[PDB]
């Protein structure tokens, strides 16, 4: 599990459950190729997106469908989605956690990169 | 104006207006002595808390009354307040902006510290 | 000035100066068309990106070039940029401030949306 | 485990390891009584602070010694510590996670409250 996504809800103080997450890899021609996707669990986590063999160095985009999340809760949001764009580097540690903390007009995101 | 406080609401995407703020300074006996207080304006800003003369070196606590803010809007929040505790003016006078971004179960705070 | 961008540095406690910002607007064919660009000033603010006339309804992407910022300061950061994607002016003209707070492996962004 | 503390480092993109954390309970006379304390683990977590029987309703303060953390890494910080002050309410869900994301001149904190 080299890539994990964790999503929290700052309005309810809870994991953000059943949020759609799409990961893309940047192709040679600067387009975004679908790579992996899923929905966050009851604990706000999405595991099993990729494998060590598939997750090569490159630029990746993690798109979190925040707009749909907020609308399903009956709350009016600002963003279309949250985007996290980063380079995977084999020099760095091997496990990437992308965390995001959501509010209707704001979000925070951090990377936890460990061995 | 060497100490300013700015507060935003992350639910509304607006300034957080009418937020009460209490500033304390640690006394010689290591208790928290009341130093200044005020409330944020329509722009979410609180100016005029103190003066260059009065804002001496010390350890200061800026308490932002987030629970009262949210309750006044009919919301039950998690935190009692947001506390920002820092040493000021240890290398000479500086200007401090304490910014805070509020959600019902979360907040962020940052400091912008300028000149010398 | 209907679109403004403000960027802070959470490591230094200062405005993030000379941050490049590129704004795109989604075209009829659903590609991202370049709309405006600029860089933050000494105050960490970017004004004058667009005009009320030009800033029509649409889906906009504000790309803040955080990697170039950090690399220019001799730091290797995590993200390529911070992207802020939103629908604008769907209920008539509004003024948008996009704020971002930067750390080498993290950022926060919020929107302040005002009048009608 | 009704109370857990998790601390992350936004400069290095890592858990915040060996951070001192002190929890206090507000007494009848408005003073802060020591309640529990510890140091975060290699995963930036502090488990086992209290038990269900001990963690009664009331106002609690979680003090995270951010200044010492940053100084041990050779980095100059702004805050003396980070403080998180909240009421424990038996009406709400039963497990509290206090999370904090640290930078030298900023921090974020959120509560994840679940059953
Ligand atoms: N100093 C002003 C501009 C300015 C606007 C805002 I609005 C602000 O407030 C926040 C609050 C949070 I919370 C953030 O995450 C961020 I980014 C900015 C700050 I500080 C400065 C000038 O004179 O130009
Ligand atoms: O298991 C976990 C529990 C909580 C967290 C919190 C992450 C987090 C991310 C942010 O961008 C801001 C913040 O205040 C917190 C991460 C992992």
GROMACS .gro file of C-alpha atoms and ligand atoms in nm:
model
  503
    1UNK     CA    1   0.000   0.000   0.000
    2UNK     CA    2   0.223   0.284  -0.127
    3UNK     CA    3  -0.063   0.534  -0.153
    4UNK     CA    4  -0.342   0.598   0.095
    5UNK     CA    5  -0.600   0.880   0.112
    6UNK     CA    6  -0.765   1.002   0.434
    7UNK     CA    7  -1.045   1.255   0.443
    8UNK     CA    8  -1.196   1.437   0.742
    9UNK     CA    9  -1.500   1.661   0.788
   10UNK     CA   10  -1.438   1.980   0.987
   11UNK     CA   11  -1.811   2.065   1.016
   12UNK     CA   12  -1.930   1.744   1.179
   13UNK     CA   13  -1.600   1.637   1.337
   14UNK     CA   14  -1.598   1.302   1.164
   15UNK     CA   15  -1.438   1.102   0.891
   16UNK     CA   16  -1.566   1.201   0.547
   17UNK     CA   17  -1.748   0.889   0.440
   18UNK     CA   18  -1.828   0.775   0.087
   19UNK     CA   19  -1.626   1.051  -0.080
   20UNK     CA   20  -1.522   0.971  -0.438
   21UNK     CA   21  -1.150   0.994  -0.501
   22UNK     CA   22  -0.981   0.974  -0.842
   23UNK     CA   23  -0.610   0.943  -0.897
   24UNK     CA   24  -0.445   1.033  -1.226
   25UNK     CA   25  -0.090   1.003  -1.359
   26UNK     CA   26   0.057   1.268  -1.586
   27UNK     CA   27   0.127   1.127  -1.931
   28UNK     CA   28   0.407   1.217  -2.171
   29UNK     CA   29   0.181   1.465  -2.354
   30UNK     CA   30   0.084   1.648  -2.030
   31UNK     CA   31  -0.266   1.493  -2.018
   32UNK     CA   32  -0.401   1.320  -1.704
   33UNK     CA   33  -0.441   0.943  -1.742
   34UNK     CA   34  -0.675   0.763  -1.501
   35UNK     CA   35  -0.472   0.558  -1.258
   36UNK     CA   36  -0.689   0.449  -0.964
   37UNK     CA   37  -1.007   0.544  -0.784
   38UNK     CA   38  -1.244   0.456  -0.503
   39UNK     CA   39  -1.473   0.582  -0.228
   40UNK     CA   40  -1.365   0.652   0.125
   41UNK     CA   41  -1.465   0.404   0.392
   42UNK     CA   42  -1.652   0.453   0.716
   43UNK     CA   43  -1.321   0.564   0.867
   44UNK     CA   44  -1.271   0.819   0.590
   45UNK     CA   45  -0.989   0.615   0.435
   46UNK     CA   46  -0.921   0.471   0.093
   47UNK     CA   47  -0.674   0.185   0.087
   48UNK     CA   48  -0.566  -0.045  -0.193
   49UNK     CA   49  -0.548   0.214  -0.470
   50UNK     CA   50  -0.228   0.080  -0.623
   51UNK     CA   51   0.067  -0.154  -0.577
   52UNK     CA   52   0.440  -0.098  -0.546
   53UNK     CA   53   0.492  -0.236  -0.900
   54UNK     CA   54   0.237   0.002  -1.054
   55UNK     CA   55   0.327   0.319  -0.859
   56UNK     CA   56   0.632   0.442  -1.048
   57UNK     CA   57   0.796   0.783  -1.022
   58UNK     CA   58   0.601   1.061  -1.186
   59UNK     CA   59   0.350   1.336  -1.127
   60UNK     CA   60   0.015   1.232  -0.979
   61UNK     CA   61  -0.312   1.411  -0.920
   62UNK     CA   62  -0.553   1.311  -0.644
   63UNK     CA   63  -0.900   1.460  -0.706
   64UNK     CA   64  -1.140   1.448  -0.412
   65UNK     CA   65  -1.509   1.504  -0.507
   66UNK     CA   66  -1.587   1.743  -0.226
   67UNK     CA   67  -1.882   1.909  -0.404
   68UNK     CA   68  -2.084   1.584  -0.414
   69UNK     CA   69  -1.990   1.507  -0.055
   70UNK     CA   70  -2.130   1.835   0.074
   71UNK     CA   71  -2.441   1.824  -0.142
   72UNK     CA   72  -2.530   1.474  -0.012
   73UNK     CA   73  -2.522   1.626   0.338
   74UNK     CA   74  -2.745   1.914   0.230
   75UNK     CA   75  -2.467   2.172   0.259
   76UNK     CA   76  -2.375   2.433  -0.002
   77UNK     CA   77  -2.005   2.422  -0.101
   78UNK     CA   78  -1.753   2.646  -0.274
   79UNK     CA   79  -1.512   2.416  -0.456
   80UNK     CA   80  -1.580   2.183  -0.747
   81UNK     CA   81  -1.333   1.939  -0.599
   82UNK     CA   82  -1.010   1.934  -0.405
   83UNK     CA   83  -0.694   1.860  -0.602
   84UNK     CA   84  -0.362   1.737  -0.470
   85UNK     CA   85  -0.077   1.730  -0.725
   86UNK     CA   86   0.264   1.590  -0.639
   87UNK     CA   87   0.570   1.407  -0.764
   88UNK     CA   88   0.638   1.055  -0.641
   89UNK     CA   89   1.014   1.025  -0.585
   90UNK     CA   90   1.188   0.697  -0.508
   91UNK     CA   91   1.455   0.884  -0.311
   92UNK     CA   92   1.196   0.981  -0.051
   93UNK     CA   93   1.033   0.736   0.189
   94UNK     CA   94   0.810   0.472   0.034
   95UNK     CA   95   0.458   0.515   0.175
   96UNK     CA   96   0.244   0.818   0.088
   97UNK     CA   97  -0.061   0.927   0.289
   98UNK     CA   98  -0.255   1.217   0.138
   99UNK     CA   99  -0.478   1.369   0.407
  100UNK     CA  100  -0.745   1.631   0.356
  101UNK     CA  101  -0.958   1.822   0.605
  102UNK     CA  102  -1.276   1.960   0.447
  103UNK     CA  103  -1.495   2.264   0.517
  104UNK     CA  104  -1.753   2.409   0.285
  105UNK     CA  105  -1.537   2.709   0.178
  106UNK     CA  106  -1.195   2.575   0.275
  107UNK     CA  107  -0.975   2.274   0.283
  108UNK     CA  108  -0.639   2.174   0.421
  109UNK     CA  109  -0.418   1.899   0.286
  110UNK     CA  110  -0.094   1.743   0.402
  111UNK     CA  111   0.134   1.459   0.300
  112UNK     CA  112   0.267   1.204   0.540
  113UNK     CA  113   0.556   1.026   0.377
  114UNK     CA  114   0.714   0.741   0.572
  115UNK     CA  115   0.908   0.413   0.562
  116UNK     CA  116  -0.102   4.904   1.593
  117UNK     CA  117   0.134   4.623   1.697
  118UNK     CA  118  -0.125   4.348   1.756
  119UNK     CA  119  -0.408   4.272   1.518
  120UNK     CA  120  -0.643   3.973   1.500
  121UNK     CA  121  -0.818   3.853   1.181
  122UNK     CA  122  -1.081   3.579   1.182
  123UNK     CA  123  -1.246   3.397   0.888
  124UNK     CA  124  -1.545   3.160   0.876
  125UNK     CA  125  -1.474   2.846   0.668
  126UNK     CA  126  -1.844   2.745   0.652
  127UNK     CA  127  -1.974   3.070   0.504
  128UNK     CA  128  -1.664   3.189   0.321
  129UNK     CA  129  -1.679   3.522   0.497
  130UNK     CA  130  -1.517   3.726   0.769
  131UNK     CA  131  -1.611   3.603   1.116
  132UNK     CA  132  -1.784   3.910   1.256
  133UNK     CA  133  -1.842   3.997   1.621
  134UNK     CA  134  -1.590   3.740   1.750
  135UNK     CA  135  -1.484   3.825   2.106
  136UNK     CA  136  -1.108   3.820   2.170
  137UNK     CA  137  -0.932   3.837   2.509
  138UNK     CA  138  -0.560   3.892   2.536
  139UNK     CA  139  -0.363   3.798   2.847
  140UNK     CA  140   0.001   3.849   2.946
  141UNK     CA  141   0.193   3.622   3.184
  142UNK     CA  142   0.269   3.811   3.507
  143UNK     CA  143   0.573   3.789   3.734
  144UNK     CA  144   0.391   3.530   3.945
  145UNK     CA  145   0.321   3.324   3.630
  146UNK     CA  146  -0.055   3.389   3.628
  147UNK     CA  147  -0.240   3.519   3.322
  148UNK     CA  148  -0.315   3.884   3.368
  149UNK     CA  149  -0.584   4.045   3.150
  150UNK     CA  150  -0.415   4.268   2.894
  151UNK     CA  151  -0.664   4.377   2.628
  152UNK     CA  152  -0.989   4.268   2.467
  153UNK     CA  153  -1.221   4.351   2.180
  154UNK     CA  154  -1.438   4.205   1.908
  155UNK     CA  155  -1.392   4.162   1.534
  156UNK     CA  156  -1.548   4.411   1.299
  157UNK     CA  157  -1.759   4.355   0.986
  158UNK     CA  158  -1.432   4.279   0.805
  159UNK     CA  159  -1.341   4.014   1.062
  160UNK     CA  160  -1.059   4.233   1.192
  161UNK     CA  161  -0.978   4.355   1.539
  162UNK     CA  162  -0.763   4.665   1.554
  163UNK     CA  163  -0.666   4.894   1.843
  164UNK     CA  164  -0.611   4.629   2.108
  165UNK     CA  165  -0.291   4.789   2.238
  166UNK     CA  166  -0.018   5.048   2.179
  167UNK     CA  167   0.352   5.023   2.104
  168UNK     CA  168   0.425   5.155   2.456
  169UNK     CA  169   0.199   4.911   2.638
  170UNK     CA  170   0.289   4.605   2.427
  171UNK     CA  171   0.611   4.519   2.607
  172UNK     CA  172   0.809   4.195   2.597
  173UNK     CA  173   0.623   3.906   2.747
  174UNK     CA  174   0.436   3.583   2.690
  175UNK     CA  175   0.093   3.660   2.552
  176UNK     CA  176  -0.221   3.453   2.513
  177UNK     CA  177  -0.478   3.550   2.255
  178UNK     CA  178  -0.806   3.372   2.332
  179UNK     CA  179  -1.054   3.376   2.049
  180UNK     CA  180  -1.403   3.300   2.173
  181UNK     CA  181  -1.506   3.057   1.901
  182UNK     CA  182  -1.776   2.880   2.105
  183UNK     CA  183  -1.963   3.206   2.165
  184UNK     CA  184  -1.929   3.288   1.793
  185UNK     CA  185  -2.082   2.961   1.676
  186UNK     CA  186  -2.350   2.952   1.945
  187UNK     CA  187  -2.457   3.306   1.848
  188UNK     CA  188  -2.513   3.161   1.498
  189UNK     CA  189  -2.720   2.874   1.638
  190UNK     CA  190  -2.447   2.608   1.600
  191UNK     CA  191  -2.303   2.373   1.867
  192UNK     CA  192  -1.923   2.367   1.814
  193UNK     CA  193  -1.648   2.146   1.957
  194UNK     CA  194  -1.391   2.384   2.107
  195UNK     CA  195  -1.434   2.626   2.392
  196UNK     CA  196  -1.203   2.879   2.232
  197UNK     CA  197  -0.887   2.898   2.023
  198UNK     CA  198  -0.578   2.991   2.222
  199UNK     CA  199  -0.270   3.140   2.064
  200UNK     CA  200   0.027   3.160   2.303
  201UNK     CA  201   0.356   3.324   2.208
  202UNK     CA  202   0.651   3.525   2.322
  203UNK     CA  203   0.644   3.878   2.182
  204UNK     CA  204   0.902   4.147   2.121
  205UNK     CA  205   1.198   3.944   2.246
  206UNK     CA  206   1.418   4.086   1.965
  207UNK     CA  207   1.266   4.432   1.983
  208UNK     CA  208   0.925   4.561   1.877
  209UNK     CA  209   0.741   4.370   1.608
  210UNK     CA  210   0.395   4.386   1.455
  211UNK     CA  211   0.185   4.073   1.497
  212UNK     CA  212  -0.119   3.962   1.302
  213UNK     CA  213  -0.287   3.657   1.450
  214UNK     CA  214  -0.517   3.499   1.188
  215UNK     CA  215  -0.763   3.221   1.250
  216UNK     CA  216  -0.986   3.021   1.021
  217UNK     CA  217  -1.289   2.866   1.195
  218UNK     CA  218  -1.503   2.557   1.139
  219UNK     CA  219  -1.738   2.404   1.395
  220UNK     CA  220  -1.498   2.114   1.482
  221UNK     CA  221  -1.169   2.263   1.362
  222UNK     CA  222  -0.956   2.573   1.338
  223UNK     CA  223  -0.628   2.689   1.187
  224UNK     CA  224  -0.421   2.976   1.314
  225UNK     CA  225  -0.115   3.147   1.174
  226UNK     CA  226   0.102   3.444   1.273
  227UNK     CA  227   0.231   3.714   1.042
  228UNK     CA  228   0.521   3.893   1.212
  229UNK     CA  229   0.672   4.202   1.057
  230UNK     CA  230   0.950   4.463   1.069
  231UNK     CA  231   1.283   4.476   1.238
  232UNK     CA  232  -1.119   4.395  -0.856
  233UNK     CA  233  -1.337   4.082  -0.844
  234UNK     CA  234  -1.061   3.821  -0.800
  235UNK     CA  235  -0.777   3.858  -0.554
  236UNK     CA  236  -0.524   3.602  -0.428
  237UNK     CA  237  -0.346   3.621  -0.089
  238UNK     CA  238  -0.066   3.383   0.010
  239UNK     CA  239   0.106   3.335   0.348
  240UNK     CA  240   0.418   3.138   0.445
  241UNK     CA  241   0.364   2.922   0.756
  242UNK     CA  242   0.740   2.856   0.804
  243UNK     CA  243   0.848   3.221   0.818
  244UNK     CA  244   0.529   3.380   0.947
  245UNK     CA  245   0.526   3.624   0.659
  246UNK     CA  246   0.355   3.700   0.332
  247UNK     CA  247   0.460   3.462   0.055
  248UNK     CA  248   0.616   3.705  -0.192
  249UNK     CA  249   0.673   3.651  -0.563
  250UNK     CA  250   0.439   3.350  -0.584
  251UNK     CA  251   0.332   3.289  -0.944
  252UNK     CA  252  -0.042   3.237  -0.997
  253UNK     CA  253  -0.215   3.116  -1.315
  254UNK     CA  254  -0.590   3.134  -1.357
  255UNK     CA  255  -0.777   2.918  -1.608
  256UNK     CA  256  -1.142   2.906  -1.714
  257UNK     CA  257  -1.317   2.596  -1.847
  258UNK     CA  258  -1.401   2.645  -2.217
  259UNK     CA  259  -1.699   2.521  -2.416
  260UNK     CA  260  -1.500   2.213  -2.517
  261UNK     CA  261  -1.421   2.145  -2.147
  262UNK     CA  262  -1.050   2.228  -2.175
  263UNK     CA  263  -0.877   2.475  -1.942
  264UNK     CA  264  -0.824   2.800  -2.122
  265UNK     CA  265  -0.568   3.047  -1.984
  266UNK     CA  266  -0.753   3.338  -1.827
  267UNK     CA  267  -0.514   3.554  -1.625
  268UNK     CA  268  -0.185   3.534  -1.439
  269UNK     CA  269   0.038   3.732  -1.207
  270UNK     CA  270   0.260   3.712  -0.902
  271UNK     CA  271   0.213   3.809  -0.539
  272UNK     CA  272   0.350   4.138  -0.416
  273UNK     CA  273   0.561   4.216  -0.107
  274UNK     CA  274   0.237   4.194   0.092
  275UNK     CA  275   0.165   3.846  -0.045
  276UNK     CA  276  -0.128   3.983  -0.244
  277UNK     CA  277  -0.212   3.961  -0.611
  278UNK     CA  278  -0.446   4.229  -0.738
  279UNK     CA  279  -0.553   4.327  -1.091
  280UNK     CA  280  -0.588   3.979  -1.237
  281UNK     CA  281  -0.917   4.059  -1.413
  282UNK     CA  282  -1.205   4.304  -1.452
  283UNK     CA  283  -1.573   4.286  -1.369
  284UNK     CA  284  -1.651   4.272  -1.744
  285UNK     CA  285  -1.408   3.992  -1.824
  286UNK     CA  286  -1.481   3.782  -1.513
  287UNK     CA  287  -1.796   3.616  -1.643
  288UNK     CA  288  -1.973   3.308  -1.511
  289UNK     CA  289  -1.768   2.995  -1.544
  290UNK     CA  290  -1.563   2.729  -1.372
  291UNK     CA  291  -1.227   2.873  -1.277
  292UNK     CA  292  -0.902   2.715  -1.167
  293UNK     CA  293  -0.653   2.917  -0.967
  294UNK     CA  294  -0.315   2.744  -0.976
  295UNK     CA  295  -0.071   2.869  -0.718
  296UNK     CA  296   0.284   2.774  -0.809
  297UNK     CA  297   0.398   2.657  -0.467
  298UNK     CA  298   0.681   2.433  -0.592
  299UNK     CA  299   0.848   2.724  -0.772
  300UNK     CA  300   0.805   2.937  -0.458
  301UNK     CA  301   0.976   2.687  -0.228
  302UNK     CA  302   1.248   2.595  -0.479
  303UNK     CA  303   1.332   2.965  -0.522
  304UNK     CA  304   1.392   2.965  -0.143
  305UNK     CA  305   1.618   2.660  -0.168
  306UNK     CA  306   1.361   2.411  -0.031
  307UNK     CA  307   1.235   2.085  -0.188
  308UNK     CA  308   0.856   2.076  -0.133
  309UNK     CA  309   0.596   1.802  -0.179
  310UNK     CA  310   0.327   1.950  -0.404
  311UNK     CA  311   0.359   2.070  -0.759
  312UNK     CA  312   0.110   2.350  -0.703
  313UNK     CA  313  -0.208   2.426  -0.513
  314UNK     CA  314  -0.520   2.419  -0.729
  315UNK     CA  315  -0.839   2.597  -0.634
  316UNK     CA  316  -1.134   2.508  -0.860
  317UNK     CA  317  -1.473   2.675  -0.829
  318UNK     CA  318  -1.779   2.800  -1.007
  319UNK     CA  319  -1.794   3.180  -1.009
  320UNK     CA  320  -2.069   3.436  -1.050
  321UNK     CA  321  -2.351   3.184  -1.087
  322UNK     CA  322  -2.582   3.406  -0.876
  323UNK     CA  323  -2.451   3.729  -1.025
  324UNK     CA  324  -2.120   3.909  -0.979
  325UNK     CA  325  -1.928   3.844  -0.660
  326UNK     CA  326  -1.586   3.937  -0.528
  327UNK     CA  327  -1.357   3.645  -0.452
  328UNK     CA  328  -1.049   3.634  -0.233
  329UNK     CA  329  -0.860   3.307  -0.259
  330UNK     CA  330  -0.625   3.273   0.040
  331UNK     CA  331  -0.361   3.007   0.084
  332UNK     CA  332  -0.129   2.921   0.369
  333UNK     CA  333   0.184   2.731   0.262
  334UNK     CA  334   0.416   2.479   0.428
  335UNK     CA  335   0.664   2.256   0.244
  336UNK     CA  336   0.443   1.941   0.275
  337UNK     CA  337   0.104   2.103   0.334
  338UNK     CA  338  -0.128   2.387   0.243
  339UNK     CA  339  -0.464   2.530   0.343
  340UNK     CA  340  -0.687   2.735   0.121
  341UNK     CA  341  -1.005   2.927   0.190
  342UNK     CA  342  -1.238   3.152  -0.010
  343UNK     CA  343  -1.386   3.481   0.104
  344UNK     CA  344  -1.684   3.565  -0.117
  345UNK     CA  345  -1.856   3.900  -0.088
  346UNK     CA  346  -2.149   4.120  -0.193
  347UNK     CA  347  -2.480   4.047  -0.351
  348UNK     CA  348  -0.941   0.449   2.459
  349UNK     CA  349  -1.183   0.745   2.472
  350UNK     CA  350  -0.912   1.003   2.400
  351UNK     CA  351  -0.635   0.987   2.143
  352UNK     CA  352  -0.395   1.258   2.018
  353UNK     CA  353  -0.234   1.259   1.672
  354UNK     CA  354   0.031   1.508   1.565
  355UNK     CA  355   0.174   1.573   1.218
  356UNK     CA  356   0.464   1.781   1.088
  357UNK     CA  357   0.386   1.998   0.785
  358UNK     CA  358   0.752   2.089   0.721
  359UNK     CA  359   0.893   1.738   0.690
  360UNK     CA  360   0.571   1.560   0.587
  361UNK     CA  361   0.588   1.315   0.873
  362UNK     CA  362   0.438   1.222   1.203
  363UNK     CA  363   0.555   1.451   1.483
  364UNK     CA  364   0.755   1.213   1.697
  365UNK     CA  365   0.837   1.245   2.066
  366UNK     CA  366   0.617   1.550   2.120
  367UNK     CA  367   0.514   1.604   2.483
  368UNK     CA  368   0.140   1.626   2.537
  369UNK     CA  369  -0.031   1.725   2.863
  370UNK     CA  370  -0.401   1.694   2.930
  371UNK     CA  371  -0.575   1.891   3.203
  372UNK     CA  372  -0.929   1.891   3.342
  373UNK     CA  373  -1.094   2.212   3.455
  374UNK     CA  374  -1.159   2.207   3.829
  375UNK     CA  375  -1.448   2.363   4.021
  376UNK     CA  376  -1.239   2.674   4.095
  377UNK     CA  377  -1.149   2.729   3.725
  378UNK     CA  378  -0.790   2.602   3.767
  379UNK     CA  379  -0.641   2.332   3.540
  380UNK     CA  380  -0.579   2.000   3.715
  381UNK     CA  381  -0.331   1.758   3.556
  382UNK     CA  382  -0.519   1.465   3.410
  383UNK     CA  383  -0.293   1.267   3.176
  384UNK     CA  384   0.022   1.307   2.969
  385UNK     CA  385   0.267   1.134   2.740
  386UNK     CA  386   0.491   1.162   2.435
  387UNK     CA  387   0.383   1.088   2.082
  388UNK     CA  388   0.502   0.765   1.927
  389UNK     CA  389   0.688   0.700   1.606
  390UNK     CA  390   0.353   0.726   1.429
  391UNK     CA  391   0.284   1.063   1.590
  392UNK     CA  392   0.013   0.915   1.814
  393UNK     CA  393  -0.050   0.905   2.185
  394UNK     CA  394  -0.279   0.628   2.301
  395UNK     CA  395  -0.375   0.514   2.648
  396UNK     CA  396  -0.413   0.856   2.807
  397UNK     CA  397  -0.725   0.770   3.004
  398UNK     CA  398  -1.005   0.518   3.052
  399UNK     CA  399  -1.380   0.536   3.007
  400UNK     CA  400  -1.428   0.537   3.387
  401UNK     CA  401  -1.190   0.831   3.438
  402UNK     CA  402  -1.297   1.046   3.140
  403UNK     CA  403  -1.611   1.211   3.273
  404UNK     CA  404  -1.796   1.507   3.122
  405UNK     CA  405  -1.619   1.837   3.168
  406UNK     CA  406  -1.385   2.086   3.008
  407UNK     CA  407  -1.043   1.954   2.906
  408UNK     CA  408  -0.727   2.118   2.780
  409UNK     CA  409  -0.477   1.936   2.558
  410UNK     CA  410  -0.140   2.119   2.556
  411UNK     CA  411   0.104   2.012   2.285
  412UNK     CA  412   0.467   2.122   2.347
  413UNK     CA  413   0.534   2.242   1.996
  414UNK     CA  414   0.816   2.480   2.096
  415UNK     CA  415   1.037   2.196   2.224
  416UNK     CA  416   0.953   1.985   1.922
  417UNK     CA  417   1.073   2.248   1.677
  418UNK     CA  418   1.382   2.338   1.878
  419UNK     CA  419   1.494   1.971   1.888
  420UNK     CA  420   1.481   1.980   1.506
  421UNK     CA  421   1.685   2.301   1.496
  422UNK     CA  422   1.392   2.511   1.376
  423UNK     CA  423   1.281   2.845   1.521
  424UNK     CA  424   0.912   2.849   1.622
  425UNK     CA  425   0.644   3.106   1.701
  426UNK     CA  426   0.415   2.947   1.959
  427UNK     CA  427   0.494   2.844   2.315
  428UNK     CA  428   0.264   2.548   2.272
  429UNK     CA  429  -0.056   2.451   2.097
  430UNK     CA  430  -0.369   2.437   2.312
  431UNK     CA  431  -0.692   2.253   2.240
  432UNK     CA  432  -0.978   2.325   2.482
  433UNK     CA  433  -1.309   2.143   2.459
  434UNK     CA  434  -1.605   2.001   2.647
  435UNK     CA  435  -1.650   1.626   2.666
  436UNK     CA  436  -2.023   1.554   2.629
  437UNK     CA  437  -2.175   1.211   2.683
  438UNK     CA  438  -2.451   1.294   2.433
  439UNK     CA  439  -2.196   1.302   2.153
  440UNK     CA  440  -2.015   0.995   2.020
  441UNK     CA  441  -1.778   0.824   2.260
  442UNK     CA  442  -1.428   0.832   2.108
  443UNK     CA  443  -1.233   1.158   2.073
  444UNK     CA  444  -0.933   1.202   1.843
  445UNK     CA  445  -0.759   1.538   1.871
  446UNK     CA  446  -0.542   1.591   1.563
  447UNK     CA  447  -0.293   1.870   1.509
  448UNK     CA  448  -0.089   1.967   1.204
  449UNK     CA  449   0.218   2.172   1.295
  450UNK     CA  450   0.419   2.440   1.113
  451UNK     CA  451   0.665   2.678   1.272
  452UNK     CA  452   0.430   2.981   1.261
  453UNK     CA  453   0.098   2.801   1.225
  454UNK     CA  454  -0.104   2.506   1.334
  455UNK     CA  455  -0.431   2.341   1.247
  456UNK     CA  456  -0.636   2.124   1.477
  457UNK     CA  457  -0.949   1.917   1.432
  458UNK     CA  458  -1.160   1.678   1.635
  459UNK     CA  459  -1.274   1.344   1.510
  460UNK     CA  460  -1.554   1.223   1.732
  461UNK     CA  461  -1.692   0.876   1.660
  462UNK     CA  462  -1.866   0.565   1.793
  463LIG     N1  463  -0.264   4.150   0.563
  463LIG     C1  464  -0.358   4.189   0.454
  463LIG     C2  465  -0.415   4.079   0.364
  463LIG     C3  466  -0.471   3.963   0.444
  463LIG     C4  467  -0.598   3.912   0.419
  463LIG     C5  468  -0.646   3.806   0.495
  463LIG     I1  469  -0.835   3.738   0.451
  463LIG     C6  470  -0.567   3.751   0.594
  463LIG     O1  471  -0.625   3.644   0.665
  463LIG     C7  472  -0.598   3.508   0.646
  463LIG     C8  473  -0.649   3.423   0.743
  463LIG     C9  474  -0.628   3.286   0.733
  463LIG     I2  475  -0.708   3.168   0.881
  463LIG    C10  476  -0.555   3.236   0.627
  463LIG     O2  477  -0.532   3.106   0.613
  463LIG    C11  478  -0.503   3.321   0.531
  463LIG     I3  479  -0.394   3.254   0.370
  463LIG    C12  480  -0.525   3.457   0.540
  463LIG    C13  481  -0.441   3.802   0.618
  463LIG     I4  482  -0.317   3.725   0.764
  463LIG    C14  483  -0.392   3.907   0.543
  463LIG    C15  484  -0.293   4.310   0.375
  463LIG     O3  485  -0.261   4.409   0.441
  463LIG     O4  486  -0.280   4.295   0.253
  464LIG     O1  487  -0.536   0.920   1.140
  464LIG     C1  488  -0.536   1.054   1.121
  464LIG     C2  489  -0.620   1.134   1.199
  464LIG     C3  490  -0.620   1.272   1.180
  464LIG     C4  491  -0.538   1.330   1.084
  464LIG     C5  492  -0.544   1.468   1.070
  464LIG     C6  493  -0.490   1.537   0.945
  464LIG     C7  494  -0.499   1.675   0.927
  464LIG     C8  495  -0.478   1.724   0.800
  464LIG     C9  496  -0.485   1.860   0.774
  464LIG     O2  497  -0.463   1.903   0.647
  464LIG    C10  498  -0.514   1.949   0.877
  464LIG    C11  499  -0.536   1.900   1.006
  464LIG     O3  500  -0.564   1.986   1.108
  464LIG    C12  501  -0.528   1.763   1.031
  464LIG    C13  502  -0.455   1.250   1.006
  464LIG    C14  503  -0.453   1.112   1.025
   0.00000   0.00000   0.00000
